[PDB]
Paper text:
Ribosomes are the protein synthesis machineries of the cell, which translate genetic codes on mRNA into protein in all living species.
Compared to Ec, Ms LSU has one additional protein bL37 located near the peptidyl transferase center (PTC). In Ms LSU, bL25 is more than double in size (215 residues) compared to its Ec homolog (94 residues) because of its additional CTD. This insertion is present at the base of the central protuberance and extends to interact with bL27. H54a is a Mycobacteria-specific 113 nt long insertion in H54 at position G1532 which emerges at the solvent side of LSU near the L1 stalk and unequivocally is the most prominent feature of mycobacterial ribosomes.
Residue numbers in the entry: 3 to 275
Write the structure that this text describes.
RNA sequence: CUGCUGUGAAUCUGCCGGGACCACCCGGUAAGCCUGAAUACUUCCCAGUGACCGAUAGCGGAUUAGUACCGUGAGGGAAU
RNA sequence: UCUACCCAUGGCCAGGGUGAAGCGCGGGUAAGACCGCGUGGAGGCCCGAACCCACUUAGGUUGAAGACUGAGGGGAUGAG
RNA sequence: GAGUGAGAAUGCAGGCAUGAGUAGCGAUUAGGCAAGUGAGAACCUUGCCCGCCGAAAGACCAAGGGUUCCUGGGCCAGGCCAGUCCGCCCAGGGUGAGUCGGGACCUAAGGCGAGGCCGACAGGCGUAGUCGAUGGACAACGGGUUGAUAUUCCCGUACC
RNA sequence: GUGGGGCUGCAUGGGACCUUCGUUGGUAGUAGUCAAGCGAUGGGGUGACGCAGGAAGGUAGCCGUACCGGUCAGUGGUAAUACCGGGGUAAGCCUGUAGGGAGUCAGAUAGGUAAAUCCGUCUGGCAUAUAUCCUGAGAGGUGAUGCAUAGCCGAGAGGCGAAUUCGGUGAUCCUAUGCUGCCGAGAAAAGCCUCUAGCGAGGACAUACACGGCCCGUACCCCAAACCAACACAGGUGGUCAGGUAGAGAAUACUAAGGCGUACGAGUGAACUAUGGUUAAGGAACUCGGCAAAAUGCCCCCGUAACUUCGGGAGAAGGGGGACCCACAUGGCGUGUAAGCCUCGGCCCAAGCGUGAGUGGGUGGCACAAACCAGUGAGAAGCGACUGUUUACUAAAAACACAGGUCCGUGCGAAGUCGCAAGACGAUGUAUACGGACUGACGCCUGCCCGGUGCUGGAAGGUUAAGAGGACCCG
RNA sequence: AAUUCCUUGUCGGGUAAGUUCCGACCUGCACGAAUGGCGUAACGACUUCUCAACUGUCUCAACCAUAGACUCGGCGAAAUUGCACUACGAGUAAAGAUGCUCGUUACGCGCGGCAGGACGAAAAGACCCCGGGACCUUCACUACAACUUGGUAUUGGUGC
RNA sequence: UCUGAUCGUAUUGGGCCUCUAACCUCGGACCGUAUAUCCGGUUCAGGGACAGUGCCUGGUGGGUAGUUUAACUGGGGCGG
RNA sequence: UGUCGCUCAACGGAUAAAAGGUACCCCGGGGAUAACAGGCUGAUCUUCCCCAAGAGUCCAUAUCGACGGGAUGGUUUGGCACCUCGAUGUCGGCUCGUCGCAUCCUGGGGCUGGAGCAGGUCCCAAGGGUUGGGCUGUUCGCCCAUUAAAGCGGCACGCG
């Protein structure tokens, strides 16, 4: 966190991430694939996700999330690199082999330090392992849901899963959301808590700083017309005049997995508060 | 009589119809396939006909006519 | 092909102020914290042309124009 | 036997009156004289003055237009007036590339999409591919001529 | 159940018999294999990218000038000591300057879907050199004994045609996709070079000569009477050049190059309307309302209040000087030649050429930012935090949005949405994330109520559909 | 009070005078806490009020110049239109008279100006009522999309 | 055989448990395929008679559609 | 054949089954029907009387005149719906006015509870005059300075 001095009215309550730990300004030519911003529109071209205006263009920087091969092959990080489309800095592994890859870069991962994938890995911050090998209680991330499928949980900034007791074939992983979902064991995970927890203390300061970042203005529901939202016109400031409701009339309740889904693994859901 | 979804048999003392349904009599032989004429129609061509029009009529169009023009476009659409 | 938003790829923004972080020096101290000085040139910063709008007023009001013209007006490195 | 009788439907098509020989004649630059051409001159042709634009009202392109360019001719149509003039009318001519802007080189967004999947049917998506510059790669400059073309023709020197 | 006795059986660590592996002895550096070159449709590098902003080097232009050609512009003065016009020339080819960037050689490895001498990666070695390589504005030479051009001539065409140095100023253009920052993290693919796979007995290079070079666009307009506007329409239209003198400037005033006088005129002091001008005395009395005008306005010094989120407010407010000539001044500053020194070199550098700012003395006017251009200021309240957005064509705001806040949903081909579905967006994202709802920075806060209506959970009761179940009844 | 009808509430300040403005009182018809409450530096072509300077806004208008207007020459429309050698008064009338009544005034035809009337032109009233549409809303009615419940088919063995 | 407690053999339903063979997997690896995150196939690893999709059936359902929403009335509305 | 099932009560009963908004509105109509003006009326309003109970030390009448009665005007709120809905533009202000007298000033007079100056009231009289500001969109009104005075009204609440 670094607070901008309140010089102009848009940098008053602003802050910008230090970006500390970033060894290199530019990503490797070999790994940075390209992705055009889609606009919030599917193949029919219609506004499908709303509020997704064009934002500075980005380049993809392939992280692989599986790392099944070369478990024994040690690695060393070379650089921690900034990534646009994560909420993270991404570490760059050179293997002994010399192939170059990208990791979502946990905390305490200095530049230079030796990590190792595979089954006889030591439990260090940074390295892959199945859930078979990890001692219960340690903080793991990336984990995944289905074996070989690749990392699909705890990928965000400073956000990590705690592995409670595995009991045979299933391991009870208690999510960042406090939800307790039993993955199977032969899935992998990456030991360590994910880096860059300093963000979300960022205020984006001014209005257009969240536009560069790709987000368009959100007209809230009341101001529109009766045609145009359930919270229609009225004559003055309407509260909504009805129970609060998605712009397509769907009630603001539930919306979780429909009944009869494959929720066998979910042994306890998150909480309201 | 016919579609979809379930159930689902019998071959002649069988089976189906005779306006719910049952009994007797009547009729017919399903779950297989073709089948001409009688009938409808007129882009085109021929031969005619008119108590049909005669150039604001008769086709939008007797004259460069779906032309000029109008319109992004579909489309509209003259006059002599 | 107008206009509303979005995607890809280009191009434009005369000129003049202001002086943030960082950096370098000096004071300070135990190091500090901090305080002056230079550098540096940030900003949905400032003044103002192109350019984009259209606030006020006058005209026009069978207009020069089926929405413009003149004097002023706002933005003008950015949500352009 | 009737498409059978109009004065009126803010009725339709053509024609023509009233307003009326009225209002206008489209800027913020401005014209004058001399001489000519001609039946005819405020406007056309030339000279001398005067004024206007000069980050344009100058010079070059894209797009779009279509011969409007040049030469000769014309002045019943048009030009908000007249016209000998014209961006108008007629007839003939004029547009020359290894290097410029493109294609034969390449892809972005996106379009189409073999098969394929989905779909009662029509069709909806999409993989390989294959198109798509507003971008990338690629070899040329200076002068001269025509009544009209010039990095195109020619001259001098180059490069792929 | 309690400890010590057991054989044997199972289980464990270690060396040895065979096997297998390791090692040297003759052969077998021979039967074996690669080695000219084109080298991929394959591999790898490169192509390969953002925004802001100086600083330096240049250069284009421009202004002067040595020098060349010329004029007497019927006036008071000026014969060349004044004035007018010249004072040019490109791509390429040489050199490799300023600037900018780079360690190189060997060995090992299968990581790059097969193979690699390439690319990675790890080891060592010698290196930090103004070395070498790469890139590269510009200067210089050549291109150019040509082409050009001021003028000269007779007379539309022809020919002749001198000098062609030096400074200064200065780009938004070039170096430059460079460099330093910064967060918002900035297309791919052909091309180019290399690597082997594979082709291969021919093939590469140099010099010369002779050749081939395809298709379309090419006129003319192009900020317009030729395009879109029904019109020879006061509107709209993207890019490239960017002269001078003042000026900070592409503002504006005049003006060069070049183009226009653009298509109803002649008049005439009517009223009145439109656009301009000026006004005694008063100065908002006008009026819905200081609307419209008028005023202020530039540069440098002095000066600055409450309040404050400590950044501002602020150019607050208010005030002074500004012209021309001369003196310090042959001074300074910039640039830099010849000479001077040192080791496409560097330093200073008389002169020249340019240019402030200030003190001092004057001079003149009514007026010295003299024209054009060019803030009105202050105090208070309401709403909105702000910069933005909006009803094209009567509403620009207090409305929208916003940064920030809370809640609800969402565990992942998620929720949500578009589609009949597959499929896609969300997102090549993973609860510090996405979606929805409200509020709208900041500061201090956000009280009570779950009865109604919703939402979330719970099945103990009542009440409830199809499906099974066919008593009794009827034909 | 962007909410307060009564209400120009009452008191205080500014003004010579203040239905607007600023501070306060509380009897809030009918403020009130994320449809947020109260504040608030900076910011506003926002709304309201006061002042300084300055002015034709005014007291109270004047003069000058352009472009129209006016005159002569050229081309030359338009909306409107039952007529026509289309006076005024007091009346009368579908209740506001150029046309009817009784009187009064007034030669014929133009031109430049001003706008009282022609219930002036334009737009088959935007208000109001009747009829019909539209679109929007909801505990109006009736359906449907979508979501969800159970059966049964796809669809089976095993044990309790 | 009865007023009724009961097993064992079939049928017939309800519930739960697990299994794998239907089916499902946007979970992997190979093949079509030189190219290919589509699709198809083989196999592994999982779910698993559940889900999904038919047919039947009850709910919620301004999300959406079609329409109704009286007349008298000293103009309508409110009242009656 | 006999009877039964409907606040079908909007009771001759449009369906077994149905509520609102529109200032975002639209279309067909209507002066059958409202708004603004005009017209009839005159409840109300305004001006003026008739009677005289009383107040006025006495005295009804100098001046007020209750309780009652009768009218004028057509200016207030109206009542009616006759003109106009195939269009009669609204309040204020400004500019320009013209008329009435039921006179605010000036002029002439009668009576006084008129000593004088100044008043009151009535009668005659419309020639001219009848201010400028503050607040309000304001008409009205309050106010501040004056004045001889700061008139009342009509004319589509005169005049777009």
């Amino acid at each position: 966190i670094r607070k901008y001095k309140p010089t102009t009215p848009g940098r008053r309550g602003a802050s910008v991430s230090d970006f500390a730990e970033i060894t290199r300004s530019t990503p490797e030519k070999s790994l940075v694939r390209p992705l055009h911003g889609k606009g919030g529109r599917n193949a029919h071209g219609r506004i499908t996700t709303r509020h997704k205006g064009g934002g500075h263009k980005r380049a993809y920087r392939v992280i692989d999330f599986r790392r099944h091969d070369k478990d024994g092959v040690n690695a060393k990080v070379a650089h921690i690199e900034y990534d646009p489309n994560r909420t993270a800095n991404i570490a760059l592994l050179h293997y002994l082999d010399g192939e170059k890859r990208y990791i979502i870069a946990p905390q305490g991962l200095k530049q230079g330090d030796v990590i190792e994938s595979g089954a006889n890995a030591d439990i260090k911050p940074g390295n892959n392992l199945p859930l078979r090998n990890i001692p219960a209680g340690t903080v793991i991330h990336a984990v995944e849901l289905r074996p070989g499928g690749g990392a699909k949980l705890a990928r965000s900034a400073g956000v990590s899963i705690q592995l409670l007791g595995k009991e045979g074939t299933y391991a009870a992983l208690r999510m960042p959301s406090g939800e307790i979902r039993r993955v199977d064991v032969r899935c992998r995970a990456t030991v360590g808590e994910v880096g860059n927890a300093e963000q979300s203390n960022i205020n984006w300061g001014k209005a257009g700083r969240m536009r560069w970042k790709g987000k368009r203005p959100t007209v809230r529901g009341v101001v529109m017309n009766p045609v145009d939202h359930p919270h229609g016109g009225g004559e003055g400031k309407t509260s909504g005049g009805r129970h609060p409701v998605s712009p397509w009339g769907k009630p603001e309740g539930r919306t979780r997995k429909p009944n009869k889904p494959s929720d066998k693994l979910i042994v306890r859901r998150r909480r309201t508060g």
